[PDB]
RNA sequence: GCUCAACGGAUAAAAGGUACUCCGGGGAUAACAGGCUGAUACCGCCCAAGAGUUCAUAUCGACGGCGGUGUUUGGCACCUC
């Protein structure tokens, strides 16, 4: 309605994904290696007009 | 006269590979899976300094605390070689 300036907005980044620390192990594969995904990206906060 | 030190000392005298392998056995001993547990992982809850212009609890909520699930990373090796 009315017109009122001076906004003020906090915003935060998503933060990074955390990989983890896992090793594979299989049927017949005892020593199957580091075997962990990488995180996600965080997420980004944008500016539209 | 022995660092025969692997110290009740198998010879005075001896290192490795096998995915080309083979035999006898073991779940006495691994891995997958089941099982037990729940540190960790996920979820919820407690208090509330603060941010939220005046207002902790609209939404977040720092230092910590308490549970649930069996659900990731874990530990045991009870079943199956």
């Given at each position: 309605?009315?017109?009122?300036?001076?906004?003020?907005?906090?915003?935060?980044?998503?933060?990074?994904?955390?990989?983890?620390?896992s090793?594979?192990?299989?049927?017949?594969?005892?020593?199957?290696?580091?075997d962990?995904?990488?995180?996600?990206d965080?997420?980004?906060?944008?500016?539209?007009?």
């Amino acid at each position: 309605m009315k017109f009122v300036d001076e906004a003020s907005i906090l915003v935060v980044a998503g933060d990074g994904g955390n990989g983890c620390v896992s090793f594979r192990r299989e049927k017949y594969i005892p020593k199957g290696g580091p075997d962990g995904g990488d995180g996600g990206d965080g997420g980004d906060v944008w500016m539209e007009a």
